[PDB]
Design a protein around this ligand. Sequence first.
Ligand SMILES: Cc1c(O)cccc1C(=O)N[C@@H](CSc1ccccc1)[C@H](O)CN1C[C@H]2CCCC[C@H]2C[C@H]1C(=O)NC(C)(C)C
Lengths: 99, 99
Amino acid sequence: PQITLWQRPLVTIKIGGQLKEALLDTGADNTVLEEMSLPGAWKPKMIGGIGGFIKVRQYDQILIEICGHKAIGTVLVGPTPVNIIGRNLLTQIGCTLNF
Amino acid sequence: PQITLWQRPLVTIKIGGQLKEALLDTGADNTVLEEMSLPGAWKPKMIGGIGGFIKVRQYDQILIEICGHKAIGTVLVGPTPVNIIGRNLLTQIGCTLNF
Ligand SMILES: Cc1c(O)cccc1C(=O)N[C@@H](CSc1ccccc1)[C@H](O)CN1C[C@H]2CCCC[C@H]2C[C@H]1C(=O)NC(C)(C)C
């Protein structure tokens, strides 16, 4: 899939048995998900936006299906208004920018 | 140019006679620039990211030279830690996501 940028680049994801919609976000170093139930141990973490900072729960080695592509990585969960797939996961699904 | 996402997708911009580095940011609807001197009138604006909101100055129909591609559009100036080229300007340089 090629994707133009006239609308937000939103994709379907499956994480922890759940279907979510998420933003492909070349500006995000990290993947950040809205409040959800993920199984397993987590670490405290703080990440910075535009913005200020939010407190998130850090989860390592999480399987996530992004637009029908499987990828494993660190997922962060916390009070983000929008699900963000950052570059740690974008590189796993072979995502490039072209201009 | 094609650009992988193993590093931050940073490009050179010329805006208001000045050279800057900026992040190609598919997760940003707007272009946001660190405090700088831009000539002419502006409007007050508030923009939300992760962490909260920042007060910005809104400038319309600004000429921006992104990686040797000329584009005109709305640029926002305010206390962002990184220069962001959002989708309003990404569509002007024929920027697509490929995976
Ligand atoms: C989530 C995240 C990380 O995990 C790591 C590094 C940065 C970020 C981060 O917040 N990145 C953002 C750009 S703002 C930015 C600030 C500093 C460095 C790089 C980018 C997102 O790419 C875009 N970001 C995605 C999304 C984040 C939650 C709030 C709604 C949007 C808002 C949008 C945004 O901020 N828009 C502006 C117009 C204000 C620029």
